[PDB]
PDB file of C-alpha atoms and ligand atoms in Angstrom:
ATOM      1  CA  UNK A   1      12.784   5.118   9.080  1.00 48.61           C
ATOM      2  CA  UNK A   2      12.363   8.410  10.514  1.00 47.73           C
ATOM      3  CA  UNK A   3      14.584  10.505  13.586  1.00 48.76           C
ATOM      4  CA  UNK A   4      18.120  10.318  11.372  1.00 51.96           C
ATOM      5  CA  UNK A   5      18.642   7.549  14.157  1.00 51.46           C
ATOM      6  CA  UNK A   6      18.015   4.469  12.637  1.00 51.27           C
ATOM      7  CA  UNK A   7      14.924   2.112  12.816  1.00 51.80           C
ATOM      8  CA  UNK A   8      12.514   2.473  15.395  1.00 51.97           C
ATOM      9  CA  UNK A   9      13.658   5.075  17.777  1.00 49.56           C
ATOM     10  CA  UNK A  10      12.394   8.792  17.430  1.00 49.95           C
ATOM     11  CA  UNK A  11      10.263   7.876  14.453  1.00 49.14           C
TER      12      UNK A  11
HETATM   13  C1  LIG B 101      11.379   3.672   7.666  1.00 49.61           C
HETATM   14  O1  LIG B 101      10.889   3.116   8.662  1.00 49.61           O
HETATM   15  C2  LIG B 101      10.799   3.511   6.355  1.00 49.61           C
HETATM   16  C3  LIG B 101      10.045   2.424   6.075  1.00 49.61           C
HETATM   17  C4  LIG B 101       9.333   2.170   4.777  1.00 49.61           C
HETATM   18  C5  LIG B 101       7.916   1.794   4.925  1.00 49.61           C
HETATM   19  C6  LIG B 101       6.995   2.976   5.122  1.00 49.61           C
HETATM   20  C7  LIG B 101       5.521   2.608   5.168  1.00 49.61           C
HETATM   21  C8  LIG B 101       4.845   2.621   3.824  1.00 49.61           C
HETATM   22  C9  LIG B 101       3.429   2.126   3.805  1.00 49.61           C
HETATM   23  C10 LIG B 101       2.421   2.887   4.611  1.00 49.61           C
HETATM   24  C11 LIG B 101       0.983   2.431   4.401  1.00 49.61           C
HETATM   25  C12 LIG B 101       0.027   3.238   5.224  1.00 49.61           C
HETATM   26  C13 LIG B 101      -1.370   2.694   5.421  1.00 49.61           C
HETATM   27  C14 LIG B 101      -2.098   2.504   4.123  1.00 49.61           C
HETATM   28  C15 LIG B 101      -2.164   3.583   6.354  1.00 49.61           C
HETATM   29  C1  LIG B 102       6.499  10.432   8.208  1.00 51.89           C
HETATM   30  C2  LIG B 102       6.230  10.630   9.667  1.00 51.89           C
HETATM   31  C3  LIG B 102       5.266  11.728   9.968  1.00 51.89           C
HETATM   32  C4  LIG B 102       6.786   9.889  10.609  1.00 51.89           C
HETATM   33  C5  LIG B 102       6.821   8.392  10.745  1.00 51.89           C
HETATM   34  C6  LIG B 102       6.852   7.581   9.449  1.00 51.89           C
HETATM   35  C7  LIG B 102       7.601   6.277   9.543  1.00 51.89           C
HETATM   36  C8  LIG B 102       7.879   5.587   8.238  1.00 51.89           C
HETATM   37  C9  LIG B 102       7.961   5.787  10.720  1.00 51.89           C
HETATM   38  C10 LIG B 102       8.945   4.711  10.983  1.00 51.89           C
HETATM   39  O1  LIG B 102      10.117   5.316  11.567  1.00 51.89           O
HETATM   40  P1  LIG B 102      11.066   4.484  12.605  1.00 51.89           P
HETATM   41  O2  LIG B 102      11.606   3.241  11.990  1.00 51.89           O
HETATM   42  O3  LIG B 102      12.100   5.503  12.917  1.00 51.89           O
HETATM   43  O4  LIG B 102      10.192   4.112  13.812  1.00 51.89           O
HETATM   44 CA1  LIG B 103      11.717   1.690  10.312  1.00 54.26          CA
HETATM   45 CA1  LIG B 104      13.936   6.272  13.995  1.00 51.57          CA
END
């Protein structure tokens, strides 16, 4: 995962 939000998202 990438953003600090989770999966998928803001990568
Ligand atoms: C968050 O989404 C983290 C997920 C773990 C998987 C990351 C992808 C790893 C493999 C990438 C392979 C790239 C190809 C060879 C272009
Ligand atoms: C490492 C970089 C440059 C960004 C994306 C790499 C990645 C593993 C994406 C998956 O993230 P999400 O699950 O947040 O979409
Ligand atoms: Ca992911
Ligand atoms: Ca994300």
């Amino acid at each position: 995962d990438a953003x600090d939000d989770g999966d998928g998202a803001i990568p």
